[PDB]
Design a protein around this ligand. Structure first.
Ligand code: HEM
Ligand code: HEM
Ligand SMILES: Cc1cc(N)nc(COC[C@@H]2C[C@@H](OCc3cc(C)cc(N)n3)CN2)c1
Ligand SMILES: Cc1cc(N)nc(COC[C@@H]2C[C@@H](OCc3cc(C)cc(N)n3)CN2)c1
Ligand SMILES: C[C@H](O)[C@H](O)[C@H]1CNc2nc(N)[nH]c(=O)c2N1
Ligand SMILES: C[C@H](O)[C@H](O)[C@H]1CNc2nc(N)[nH]c(=O)c2N1
Ligand SMILES: [Zn+2]
Lengths: 404, 405
């Protein structure tokens, strides 16, 4: 019933009682574990239950649980669903759901910050045009000249009649990927499809490796519309190396703001199909995955040749050496440009602190080991040695289909 | 789609479905409500017979004589034997087959491309702790082969009704002492603190180095275990040096050549081999990253970063990453120089991808534990980081088993 959970470095044991609050099945069965899969294979009575449970969550969180205001709020929601099929959240309830969805996210190592989230209410949005204004204000706020501040902006919820509000881009800042005659890619290979969708809805493309993409924003049942982000709003960091001089000449750079924009926010049964959120980068996201993945910018080889390493054989560990400097370069450059970054040691240490905090607060913390453990130097970080239970709690961020 | 797990590689964009998982006869620890895949250890006449029949079925499949007269006579032979004894016995070639299949089935092993090349020593005639020792010594000699390492397993008698087990108390054939100090620290390998203390309690005269090879504690049925010292010439060790950091040799770090797991249970067709030590060759990250750099193992990262002159006061210098890479290069360099088989985490994972593809064609999938397959340094620099994996238990298997004491 309740899983024993051991840290292998310290020999300490806890018991997860929180997982008993899960009400959504993940992918695993007793016959086989599917925990390393990235995606899943994927009614008034049931909306009422999710809503009840979430309002309960809310009033508990403000300690007014059971009181008059709590009863009256449960009545409003019920009366509203029975009549209309749906309901709406109060701004304060929303703010709480957003924080909580972040707190519940098993794949996020940055959760120590969960209580500090600026929530922009954009539920009074009726056009791609308005979406764009809200998106620009979010970016300005979040960026704050390099002093990054966590933020979410919440667009109008999904409804029975109509199409969704959608940001088509997976992130608010993305570099173009250009498919070439010879089938190779200029720019970021991850963004091939979105680059092409932009061109098709009328974008004049560049030809660089680091061209910031426009936004395709979709108001309900309408064609998506194209919006260019003003260049001065997209803070970028040119990459250099503390001791390696040539490195700067590789012309590498990355943007400051990691802002997820294709994920669905679910609160109390209500669904928010456009609810972009941002914090700040952990350097291994840029240094290791975005620049070193073979199906990304794939720069290892370039770098190692520049370092004059023996590229001929795996056992010289040239890949491990190059990766280490590229990560160092990212940290150096962000520090130099006074933009917020966290290294993977600092981040995982504070994740451990968060795990402890959550054990005392809620009796557990849903966590996805494969995603929490950094993509270089796993066992050198404390999370490697930590056993973790993965389950789904609501409020949640979920994946959702692409709108095309 | 088919109703079998869809499995994706996010580097190459390629897709497969694991149908082999259908053959699983045993529940792991996960449920629809929570995944427990990161946990290291999560918590009879008719049962035996049906496990047996299934294994015999596998054997006869594997020789392409499935449904034959020799198949139905073997089945009949097996049930007769249980009917009159409560147990049964494997033919020689059956044990060979099932030992290989147990390796083949091991979700945590990245070295499985090698699974068809296992020397199987049959030691089911063994009858004393002294004889266990001779067998083990022969195993080590053969497996070691002056540094040209060869995979091997030695199989001692299976569990019997009421009669006591054969047990190797040590967790590996080669293990370094861990001495608990008066200041509360540990000299040597802290992983081996309990076994060192049991060795002394059973009459071993301990040393006081960081790298004292432990003696073997060997248990024959219903007997207290007996102590045997390995002759130093049988235990091949590699002194560690670095190709360019001249001072690294001065640290006096060393590791042994032969990784030989001695405390796991080999289960075949319901039969349980409580002593069945097996060995291969190391992947370099086991030594240089885990055994040397784990904070609860040798913990040498700081010391090495100091020697390298790194800024150890700030996480953001990546001093931990830089030192681990060098310790890892030193392991590879030194094994190479000493002509002792070893494989780096790149070569190994590449070959595990080849193995996945072979197994896809051969069996329709491959049970694999992603957290153990991905190496503990440079994870996403290896092709297996990007490969989804399905984890499940197939038999024959190696399982963990309660410590004999
Ligand atoms: C405050 C600084 C933060 C840091 C350092 C951080 C760190 C990370 C990292 C490293 C990942 C894995 C990313 C990847 O591999 O692509 C991640 C995932 C995630 N984070 Fe954060 N995070 C932060 C803030 C936030 C915020 C503000 C939210 C939402 C309000 C959030 C929600 C999520 C979610 C839902 C995922 C899973 C994404 C997915 O499934 O693709 N994080 N976080
Ligand atoms: C041929 C060279 C081999 C290599 C490079 C290799 C590689 C590995 C590695 C790196 C591990 C993880 C070790 C750890 O983190 O504790 C492992 C685990 C394992 N291997 Fe191998 N292996 C090899 C041969 C073998 C052989 C010959 C067998 C048995 C016949 C075997 C069976 C196992 C089992 C059962 C595990 C899991 C052990 C556990 O859960 O503690 N491997 N293998
Ligand atoms: C808030 C935040 C902070 C921070 N430091 N980093 C992030 C990174 O965002 C995570 C994104 C979400 C994931 O993308 C969604 C996705 C899923 C799948 C299956 C495919 C695909 N192309 N894209 C992969 N990385 C987000
Ligand atoms: C055969 C082989 C080759 C190779 N390159 N590497 C290996 C590594 O062996 C795996 C080790 C031994 C295992 O010990 C398991 C164990 C230990 C203890 C103290 C108790 C227990 N129940 N089970 C875990 N990791 C084995
Ligand atoms: C296939 C595997 O699950 C996939 O590569 C995962 C592994 N761990 C990850 N971890 C993080 N943080 N982000 C990722 O994109 C991935 N990818
Ligand atoms: C908690 C976690 O499961 C544990 O640290 C695992 C992670 N992956 C591993 N992988 C291997 N190969 N060996 C190990 O000992 C571990 N330890
Ligand atoms: Zn699972």
């Amino acid at each position: 019933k309740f899983p024993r959970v051991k840290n292998w470095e310290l020999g300490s044991i806890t018991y997860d009682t929180l997982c008993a609050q899960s009400q959504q099945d993940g992918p695993c069965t007793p016959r086989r574990c599917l925990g390393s899969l990235v995606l899943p294979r994927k009614p008034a009575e049931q909306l009422l239950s999710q809503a009840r449970d979430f309002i309960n969550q809310y009033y508990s969180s403000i300690k007014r649980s059971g009181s008059q205001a709590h009863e009256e709020r449960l009545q409003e929601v019920e009366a509203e669903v029975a009549s209309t099929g749906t309901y709406h959240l109060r701004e304060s309830e929303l703010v709480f759901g957003a924080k909580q969805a972040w707190r519940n996210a098993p794949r996020c190592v940055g959760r120590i910050q969960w209580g500090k989230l600026q929530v922009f209410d954009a539920r009074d949005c009726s056009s791609a045009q308005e979406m764009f204004t809200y998106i620009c204000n979010h970016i300005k706020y979040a960026t704050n000249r390099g002093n990054l501040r966590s933020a979410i902006t919440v667009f109008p919820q999904r409804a029975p009649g109509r199409g969704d509000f959608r940001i088509w881009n997976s992130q608010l800042v993305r570099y173009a990927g250009y498919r070439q005659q010879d089938g190779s890619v200029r720019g970021d290979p991850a963004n091939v499809e979105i680059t092409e969708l932009c061109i098709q809805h009328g974008w004049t493309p560049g030809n660089g490796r680091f061209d910031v993409l426009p936004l395709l924003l979709q108001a309900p049942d309408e064609a998506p519309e194209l919006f260019v982000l003003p260049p001065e709003l997209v803070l970028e960091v040119p990459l250099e190396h503390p001791t390696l001089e040539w490195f700067a000449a590789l012309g590498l750079r990355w943007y400051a703001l990691p802002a997820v924009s294709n994920m669905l926010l679910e609160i109390g049964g209500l669904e928010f199909s456009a609810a972009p959120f941002s914090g700040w980068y952990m350097s291994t996201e840029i240094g290791t995955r975005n620049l070193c993945d073979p199906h990304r910018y794939n720069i290892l080889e370039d770098v190692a040749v520049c370092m004059d390493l023996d590229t001929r054989t795996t056992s010289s560990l040239w890949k491990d050496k190059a990766a280490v400097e590229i990560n160092l370069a990212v940290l150096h450059s962000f520090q130099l440009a006074k933009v917020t970054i966290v290294d993977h040691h600092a981040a995982t240490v504070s994740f451990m602190k968060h795990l402890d905090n959550e054990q005392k607060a809620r009796g557990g913390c849903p966590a996805d080991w494969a995603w929490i453990v950094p993509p270089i130097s796993g066992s050198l970080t404390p999370v490697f040695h930590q056993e973790m239970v993965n389950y789904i709690l609501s409020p949640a961020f979920r994946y959702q289909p692409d709108p095309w």
